[PDB]
Scaffold this active site. Structure first.
Site, PDB file in Angstrom:
ATOM      1  N   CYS A 292      -5.054   0.865  11.416  1.00  0.00           N
ATOM      2  CA  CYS A 292      -3.424   0.631  10.899  1.00  0.00           C
ATOM      3  C   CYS A 292      -2.595   0.750  12.110  1.00  0.00           C
ATOM      4  CB  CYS A 292      -2.924   1.148   9.581  1.00  0.00           C
ATOM      5  SG  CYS A 292      -1.772   1.089   8.598  1.00  0.00           S
TER       6      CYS A 292
ATOM      7  N   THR B 216       0.678  -1.073   0.251  1.00  0.00           N
ATOM      8  CA  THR B 216       0.110   0.494   0.087  1.00  0.00           C
ATOM      9  C   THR B 216       0.711   1.480   0.000  1.00  0.00           C
ATOM     10  OG1 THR B 216       0.140   0.028   2.144  1.00  0.00           O
ATOM     11  CG2 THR B 216      -1.955  -0.487   0.968  1.00  0.00           C
TER      12      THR B 216
ATOM     13  N   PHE C 135      -6.504   5.116   6.955  1.00  0.00           N
ATOM     14  CA  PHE C 135      -6.089   3.658   7.665  1.00  0.00           C
ATOM     15  C   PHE C 135      -6.869   2.951   8.947  1.00  0.00           C
ATOM     16  CE2 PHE C 135      -2.921   7.365   6.980  1.00  0.00           C
ATOM     17  CZ  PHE C 135      -1.643   6.746   6.252  1.00  0.00           C
TER      18      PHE C 135
END
Ligand code: HEM
Ligand SMILES: CCCCCCCCCCCCCCCC(=O)NCC(=O)O
Length: 457
Positions: free
Chosen positions: A399, A267, A392
């Protein structure tokens, strides 16, 4: 209570065939444009609801009412990522245990400790480009993947993938991409076990073995090493969870290594590629970013404090994450019966999908110019309404590597902007390839060196 919009159907297959495309997220975004903030998506024996507005997504983000769900895509990824952090249920013992053991690896002290190794790989990227001949161009996502894979390998596992020493794919990347592509393709399969997919199954198992052979190499390299490391892998192998007092077991460690090598770079490569794409398509924005890089990065190589000072570069990255979040969706399930947005009744267990790129285009939040690339939207992050910007994820399941990703991407983009002038020499037409994650495909540019010497290390 209101009836819920739903896209076109294919008889007994219901909406399933709409996922028979190599660009499902983009297809779902077009459906959301047509149907609105919420639509139902049915498949034989399965249903989920796609959310696109901040007003409903803010409710879905209330952890007292909804918990992270493993979407079908994550259930397929779990075949190789197991109960690693990204594919574990919040209630599985190994989620909180690994979360507690690994969180320290993303502390500010740890980030300061990774900086030098991030510079090592960033210098390799800048040198590759400085060394290109006049005729030549750059394959952007390919080189961003070289950079991000090497960075997580070195910072996290003291392992060198040496991606800049290769013109062709590392078997790891080829197998990783093919495994993610297979998971995405399995989403539309009505009959997953029909014999016509035996070859897909064989190839999937082969790709999983390749990833596991790499994990074996990293573990062997660490055991046989003399260099004393205190990185992610050190904590995985030796750290104890303060709550249970237990360390991770071998099987879970293997899943975390696979998880972090994949989530820890794929990512970020997408983010860097989209950021550079938007910069070359918005000359004035690129000028502002380049001016900041030149002004701030006054030393041969960037210091940790200097990277934290690249404010505008950071705004550029957030605006790239707004338009094209590389992990494009996350899923939730209702903890108990509840009513969503005062009009949509949900039963305990019902699933929701957050379509992040659509959330990020909610005009009631951002204004009407949502398609424009304007880093200035992030001049003052505090004015951004809660749950309006979610690249996120959410809450306790957000995340864990967010700061690592942003520090790496800010450092690299800053160095790129300091050292070269970029040209969209082919007037590249954005083509977004999907493998669950999103990334530009075929994006190329030319980089003319500003001839600024690079420092050692
Ligand atoms: C800009 C690049 C990145 C983006 C957009 C991103 C996005 C996300 C999102 C949306 C989630 C939540 C998924 C869900 O709810 O299903 C997530 C989880 C996660 N990410 Fe990232 N991520 C990025 C970079 C990284 C990096 C570099 C690492 C490794 C250092 C990483 C490691 C993880 C892990 C381990 C989880 C699972 C956390 C947990 O549930 O305990 N991410 N990420
Ligand atoms: C082990 C780390 C793996 C990191 C990969 C992260 C990818 C996660 C992508 C989230 C899912 C993308 C959405 C795909 C389209 C969709 O709506 N699918 C519905 C479903 O999967 O149930």
């Amino acid at each position: 209570i209101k009836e819920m919009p739903q896209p076109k159907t294919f008889g007994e297959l219901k909406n399933l065939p709409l996922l028979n495309t190599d660009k499902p997220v983009q297809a779902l975004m077009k459906i959301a444009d047509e149907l609105g903030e919420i639509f139902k998506f049915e498949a034989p024996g399965r249903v989920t609801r796609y959310l696109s507005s901040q007003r409903l997504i803010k409710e879905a983000c209330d952890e007292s009412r909804f918990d992270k769900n493993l979407s079908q895509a994550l259930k397929f990824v779990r075949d190789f990522a197991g109960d690693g952090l990204f594919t574990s249920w919040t209630h599985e013992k190994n989620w909180k245990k690994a979360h507690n053991i690994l969180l320290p690896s993303f502390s500010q002290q740890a980030m300061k400790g990774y900086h030098a190794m991030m510079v090592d790989i960033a210098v390799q990227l800048v040198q590759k480009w400085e060394r290109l001949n006049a005729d030549e161009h750059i394959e952007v996502p390919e080189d961003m993947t070289r950079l991000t894979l090497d960075t997580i390998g070195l910072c996290g596992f003291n392992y060198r993938f040496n991606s800049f020493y290769r013109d062709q794919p590392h078997p790891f990347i080829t197998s990783m991409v093919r495994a993610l592509d297979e998971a995405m393709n399995k989403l539309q399969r009505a009959n997953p076990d029909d014999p016509a997919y035996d070859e897909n199954k064989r190839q999937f198992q082969e790709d999983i073995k390749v990833m596991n052979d790499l994990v074996d190499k990293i573990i062997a390299d660490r055991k046989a090493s003399g260099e004393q490391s205190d990185d992610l892998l050190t904590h995985m192998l030796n750290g104890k969870d303060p709550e249970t007092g237990e360390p991770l077991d071998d099987e879970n460690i293997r899943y975390q290594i696979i998880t972090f090598l994949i989530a820890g770079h794929e990512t970020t490569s997408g983010l860097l590629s989209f950021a550079l794409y938007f910069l070359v398509k918005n000359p004035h924005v690129l000028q502002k970013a380049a001016e900041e890089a030149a002004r701030v990065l006054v030393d041969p190589v960037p210091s940790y404090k200097q990277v934290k000072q690249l404010k505008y570069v950071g705004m550029v990255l957030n605006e790239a994450l707004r338009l094209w979040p590389t992990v494009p969706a996350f899923s939730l399930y209702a903890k108990e019966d509840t009513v969503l947005g005062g009009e949509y009744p949900l039963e305990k267990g019902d699933e929701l999908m957050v379509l992040i790129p659509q959330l990020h285009r909610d005009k009631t939040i951002w204004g009407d110019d949502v398609e424009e690339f304007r880093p200035e939207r992030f001049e003052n992050p505090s004015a951004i309404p809660q749950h309006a910007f979610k690249p996120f994820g959410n809450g306790q399941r957000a995340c864990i590597g967010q700061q690592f990703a942003l520090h790496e991407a800010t450092l690299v983009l800053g160095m790129m902007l300091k050292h070269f002038d970029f040209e969209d020499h082919t007037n590249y037409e954005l083509d977004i390839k999907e493998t669950l994650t999103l990334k530009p495909e075929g994006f190329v540019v030319k980089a003319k060196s500003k001839k600024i010497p690079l420092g050692g290390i």
